[PDB]
Amino acid sequence: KQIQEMKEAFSMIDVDRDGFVSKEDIKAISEQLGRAPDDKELTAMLKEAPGPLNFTMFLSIFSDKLSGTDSEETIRNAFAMFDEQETKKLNIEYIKDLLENMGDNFNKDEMRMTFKEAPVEGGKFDYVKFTAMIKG
Amino acid sequence: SQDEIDDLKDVFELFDFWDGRDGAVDAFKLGDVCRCLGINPRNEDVFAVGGTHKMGEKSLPFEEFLPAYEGLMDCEQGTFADYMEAFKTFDREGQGFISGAELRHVLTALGERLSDEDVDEIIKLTDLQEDLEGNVKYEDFVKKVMAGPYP
Amino acid sequence: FSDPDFQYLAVDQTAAFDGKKNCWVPDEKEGFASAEIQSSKGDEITVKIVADSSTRTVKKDDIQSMNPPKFEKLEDMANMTYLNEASVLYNLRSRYTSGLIYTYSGLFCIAVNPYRRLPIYTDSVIAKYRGKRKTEIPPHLFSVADNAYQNMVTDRENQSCLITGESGAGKTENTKKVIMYLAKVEDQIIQANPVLEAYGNAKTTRNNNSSRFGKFIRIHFGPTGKIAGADIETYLLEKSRVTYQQSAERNYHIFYQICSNAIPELNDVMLVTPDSGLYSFINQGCLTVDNIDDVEEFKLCDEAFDILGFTKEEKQSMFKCTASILHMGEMKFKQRPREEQAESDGTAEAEKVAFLCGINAGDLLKALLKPKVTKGQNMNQVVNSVGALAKSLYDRMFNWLVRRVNKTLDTKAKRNYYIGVLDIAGFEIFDFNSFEQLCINYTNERLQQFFNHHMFILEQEEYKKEGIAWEFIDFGMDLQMCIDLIEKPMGILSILEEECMFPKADDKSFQDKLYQNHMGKNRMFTKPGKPTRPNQGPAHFELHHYAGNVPYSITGWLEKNKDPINENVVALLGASKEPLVAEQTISAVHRESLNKLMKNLYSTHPHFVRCIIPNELKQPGLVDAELVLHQLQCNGVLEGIRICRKGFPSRLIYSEFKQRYSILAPNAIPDGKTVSEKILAGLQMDPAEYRLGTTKVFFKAGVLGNLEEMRDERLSKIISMFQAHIRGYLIRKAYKKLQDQRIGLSVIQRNIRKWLVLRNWQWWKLYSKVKP
């Protein structure tokens, strides 16, 4: 189902419906929606694919991105590992503290980028809903 | 004994490492250290030997640590009798019950208080449950807490 | 209540009273004086005497706190703010000079001798005291009696009244009123006094009707709470008064009754000439007795023998044997320059004697002048064995007499419990004191110490028993010593007793053998001091008795303790014609009677009556404060009241005590009454701050508040320890995670940095965009 989308996607992106994605293909659709990348962005954005962009080298680079990651269950647990009472929520000051200056310290930006999305309401940061959002 | 002092060693590391490995531990953790070697001293107890109210306040070597544990050993531990006795004084019915709400009050409000978090904590851990009237057999609870996290 | 019956029974009070100016200051005449402070000066206070309005100084620590007019003539002194020798003496003396002679001192009663008849004992008055609770009605002896009754009944146990006081106080009068009372709520009982008093009483300087024997009378009760019998016990009758009587004193009452002509018909039956001053044995000291009509007393005594159910022969046997004595002392003698053995100086009087005792006058004077193996006696050895005989007869008459009056009272009816009354002869100090007195005094001591035991020693014990709360208090009231000096193993009496068994002994080996043992080894024993009263005869040593220092003359104490009548004459009389006549040392014997009495007492719920002699003049309504105050001291009144106010108000049933105070020594609890015995024991609790109890514990004041202190403390700790236990559990629970959390964090840290960098990938951006 990750594929079914990819295709239908490649379809909407491949404007000149020629089964290939060209600098004009990308630029084209981007603009039809939100601001689009500059030539340099579009250039190196394609150079990321050895040869022509058939629906194959497409699924290839996309799959090689999302590779090297774990489970929604494996992560939801690394979380409940700080959820002693098993409430399915972490107190915001806590989590922020963990990530911020513990282990492999994050940075303010990593910190902002991360919480700009985070689902915190009532002081408690729901790591379930957020594990989903970050995953499937 | 040696196998004993070795144990202090073992644990001292796990800790001294987490508050920045350097062969020294924050005196504010001296409690939790010993709490790991079995013992459960009382906050009043810990400060008596060297503990501190806050982090940063001060760090300690393994040399000064040995006697803090020699100390927190000779200190009184509560038997089942004692926990049963005290809990009885809150039971008007006399049938080994109590309500959640009150139990909560005893823990959070009386004696060396316990944060509201540690409470919802241990409740969930020991998986303590109330009936329709919202009461709990304090006998069971005491037994679990006494049991350990891994029985 | 408007009841005429309360004239001399109910108390009949404001202004001029500054609780900081007014106080009690020592006095020499009044014991204490009403003073009003004028000026302090370190310790030298300067007060003004309210009476004469004179002035003086007084150490500050010698002032006594006066009580406010709020407690004027108070009925119960334990309710006064101040219970000091001056507040007590004032209260009594206040009441007394107003007719009120009864006052409660806490749990026991105080009777001050009226020396006049009072309309407070009538049947009218008895009606009102019946079943009344002590606080409900004025203070009275009936109340004390009425209450002991209720207790025996409801509590189902024996009661007992120890009526104490000095000689001439009211011990006897009050003992009789108690019986008369209990009898009214029977006729023979009341009637046993007139005969026993005739034979065992005598005028003395102190008392015109001095009791010369100890009396313990028990009154039995049946299943409906009514009198169902009664018995009498007597102790140490003054064998000596029979033949001898110090000046201003008389012999027993009978002898004088017998020579008055109350019943002329009897003159020839006894062979007496109605003249007392005719018989040596009874005219030594006094003859008549201001306020004692020997004529009428004789009649009533005769009348009483009838009611007692005495056959005419029986009661004529008595009268004759006693009139016979009046003759033993008329038998004159002589010697006969040569050997002296002794010969008679007539026979007229010595026959009347043999006659009345139904024995041969010949065989008599014979076994009296050459007692049989024979052994003649000199001229005095005889006149003294005459006395030995008189005394010994009279001691048998009196004993038989009592046995007989008990015959008439031991109704074989059904007995439940009883109420005894103890009237023992009291302390008396004369110009000359000998063995007789030591015996009476040793007796009276003794008793006082009983009150001390049951009052202080005792009270606190029970507190412990029941297992209440309390801290001890030393009232410093013990005479075990004085007691010990006289009774213990090597004591005074024991020395004398072992000195009699030696025929060699004498008044000097006895006197020396005494100092030999106690001089300097016991401070109660002190060389004779210096005269505190004229005509003060010889003294060999002094004893410090509760109520006085007594200089004792030990001359003749060896014969006095070893009796001695011709075993010969005892044979004559052994087979006499008269039917009555036909029918161990003294010390040991009496010591034993006494110990047995005491033993019988201890098994009781005692109510105490305290008699008080108002003055040394025998006149009514007059007070001698010094003397009074002095008694309010050696009797232990004040202290006797402190504990009634002080006491141990706590009380706990071991069942409720164990449940509340187990948590104070649980490492000693393996029965509610022993568990507490343990807890309070563990806590190393002072035996003082608490007391025993059968069903409950008694903790002195405050102590229980303090136990609830320790109780909390522990309850707080334990609560902490369980919180510590919860702290340690949660810590140890998260111990794997310190490894587990180190991983569980690296997941999140590395796996968010991914989702972070994936959103910063143009492709993904644009992708996400298309999405819809």
Author numbering:
A (entry chain Y): 15 to 150
B (entry chain Z): 4 to 154
C (entry chain C): 5 to 16, 24 to 196, 216 to 402, 410 to 620, 643 to 729, 734 to 835
Tell me what the authors wrote about this structure, in their words.
Myosin heads consist of a motor domain (MD), which has the catalytic and actin binding functions, and a lever arm that amplifies small structural changes within the MD to produce filament sliding. The lever arm consists of a small folded domain, dubbed the converter, a long α-helical peptide that binds the two light chains, an essential light chain, ELC, and a regulatory light chain, RLC. Insect flight muscle (IFM) possesses a highly ordered paracrystalline arrangement of myosin and actin filaments that provides detailed X-ray diffraction patterns and electron micrographs. Here we report on further investigations into the HST state of IFM using a 2 ms duration stretch (str-HST) or release (rls-HST) and their effect on both the structure and distribution of cross-bridges as they adjust to the mechanical perturbation.
In the step-release experiment (rls-HST), the fiber was released by 0.75% in 2.5 ms and the freezing impact occurred 6.5 ms later. Although a step release decreased the total number of weak attachments, it did not change the relative proportion of pre-stroke versus TM-bridges (71% : 29%). The range of structural variation in weak-binding attachments can be appreciated by superimposing the quasiatomic models onto a common origin. With the MDs superimposed onto that of the scallop transition state structure, the image can be interpreted as inherent flexibility of the myosin head. In contrast, more of the weak-binding bridges in rls-HST are pre-stroke bridges (gray) and therefore their lever arm angles appear anticlockwise with respect to the scallop structure. Weak-binding myosin heads within the target zone sweep out a smaller axial range, 27° (5 nm) for str-HST and 9° (2 nm) for rls-HST, than the strong-binding heads. The azimuthal mode for weak-binding bridges in iso- and rls-HST is 120° and represents attachments that did not need their lever arms azimuthally rotated away from the starting crystal structure in order to fit within the EM density. For a 6–9 nm release, the detachment rate also increases to 104 s−1, but the conversion from weak to strong binding is even faster, >105 s−1 (k45), indicating that most of the pre-stroke attachments would convert to strong binding ones. Releasing the muscle moves the target zone toward the end of the shortening cycle thereby “consuming” the available TM-bridges by presenting them with a favorably placed target zone to which they can bind strongly.
